Structure formats: C-alpha cells, structure tokens
Design a protein that fits this description.
1 chains; alpha+beta; 3-stranded antiparallel sheet; globular; binds zinc ion; RNA-binding; antiviral protein; a protein complex; a protein
RNA sequence: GUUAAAACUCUUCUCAUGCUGGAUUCGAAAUUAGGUGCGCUUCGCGUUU
C-alpha cells in the first residue's frame, strides 16, 4: 500500500453544485475520479475500464481537502458545513464562494489560489504503474474538476508529486473526513456515472452518512474516509 | 469513468469642455567718391574823313 501526496491548487475556479442550490466549498474525490477516468479513456489506458467500475476497491481517491497556511489539511468541523484545521482555525467557510452572473448563466464558484490535498490511495502495485503515468500527464497539462470543463472552469495544477507510502488507521473510533456510504444514515448524497461510450447520465442518489462524525468500527479499513484522531 | 453535457457579463455611450508662447531688448558700431587732368587752341580795333 502507498499514496501519492499533493498540494493541488486552482488556476481557474471550480463550480460544483449540490442539491438545494448548495455549492460545495472544496473539490471532492468523486470529481477527481470522474476526471481521471476521462483521462484514462482519452489516453486508451486499461484502468479506464476499472474507472467505470464504482467498486474496484483499489485506487481509492481521498477528497481534495483544502490545505492551510499552517501546512495542515483543514479537518472538517464536526457536523458542520465549514472546515477548521487542527492548528489555529483559519476557517474556510462560504465566504470563498462568489455568486456569478455571466450571460444569463447565474451560478457560483470558489476562488483560485487556495491549495488542496492530493491523496490517491492505491492498493495494487500493478495499478501504480498507470498511476504514475496519470499523475505525470496532470504534471504537464493539468486536471479539470467541476462544471464547464470545456469552458475552462476547474483547472488544477499539482506542485508536489510525491509517491510517499502510508498505513491504514489504528483506532476503531474514527472521524468521518468525507461523506460515507452507510445505508439508513439519513444524510442524502448524490453523484453520477456518465458512461460516455454508451450515454445515460445516471444522477445516482443515496442516503449515506455525513462528514464530521466520530464512529466506532473494528471492521474498518478506511466515499468516506477514516481520521486517526 | 465529475447531480454531467450544453450557454462568450453581452449590447448602448468619442476624456470632452474652458486657456493665444506671451512678456523684455533699435542691425549698429568703425570707414570723407577720394585720387589724376590749365577753357585751351585760331583771328592786330581794321577801314573811313
Ligand atoms: Zn490553521
């Protein structure tokens, strides 16, 4: 097991809508998965076939959680929309969003300059050979996460491709960094599969668990995530 | 293989109006149209009582 670390920053702003006209503050790992699968199909890579597999259970993408001037990731504030890093507060929040009115199109973005965590957890080392190639393409051109990729919104640039290994969590009690798939969890989560080869945009809805919640689970390996805490 | 994809903050509107490169100072200070050359040459106040 290993992971590729990164201080992924935004060249142009990203627009990710949620339900209830909510715009997400930071970019999520689902968006990274959806973009990297387009990369692997576009470069005729084999893992693209696994990219259209939503339960491959290797190459799991952790959320692009924002990084602070404290050098640490903003830990998500428990049961709250905004985030707060363990060192100081520096609290992210909505102020970073801007209401956009552009040619009829009224939407929102999140501004550029803030840095976000790259963390691609990979299990199979055979997949790491293609993983080095896809992080090496982004290294040259960039990745686009958001809406209006063809208009140019969402351009991301890595500044630190680091393939440093890691180990899973220890405590059973873990904090939910990202929203987790837990049935009858009363926190509705929506994403989609596009399947551009065969069309049929999906808009898959679910009722998983929300982020910022301490939960005890001995059967935990750590799209939810496990914070060691 | 991103609750996607698709949609150019676009159109209209002259940095314009008002203000003179003007005021002061003389082309005049120095220099004699001067120097050379003879109105000369020729002809008796005759004749007549
Ligand atoms: Zn901080």
């Amino acid at each position: 097991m290993k992971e590729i670390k990164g201080i992924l920053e935004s060249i142009t702003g990203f627009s990710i809508p949620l339900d209830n006209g909510e715009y997400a503050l930071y970019p999520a790992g689902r968006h990274l998965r959806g973009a990297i699968g387009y990369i692997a199909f576009n470069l005729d890579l084999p893992i693209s076939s696994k990219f259209l597999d939503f339960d491959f259970d290797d190459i799991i993408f952790r959320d692009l959680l924002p990084i602070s001037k404290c050098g640490k990731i903003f830990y998500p504030e428990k049961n709250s929309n905004s985030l707060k890093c363990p060192s100081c507060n520096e609290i992210y929040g909505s102020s970073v969003l801007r209401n956009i009115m552009a040619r009829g199109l009224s939407y929102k973005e999140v501004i550029e300059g803030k840095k976000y965590r790259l963390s691609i957890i990979v299990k199979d080392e055979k997949y790491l050979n293609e993983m080095e190639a896809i992080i090496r393409y982004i290294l040259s051109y960039g990745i686009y996460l958001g809406n209006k990729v063809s208009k140019g919104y969402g351009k991301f640039k890595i500044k630190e491709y680091s393939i440093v290994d890691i180990l899973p969590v220890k405590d059973s009690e873990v904090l939910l960094l990202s929203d987790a798939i837990i049935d009858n969890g009363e926190k509705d989560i929506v994403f989609s599969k596009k399947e551009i080869s065969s069309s049929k945009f999906e808009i898959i809805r679910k009722r998983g668990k929300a982020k910022g919640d301490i939960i005890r689970d001995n059967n935990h390996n750590g799209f939810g995530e496990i914070i060691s805490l």
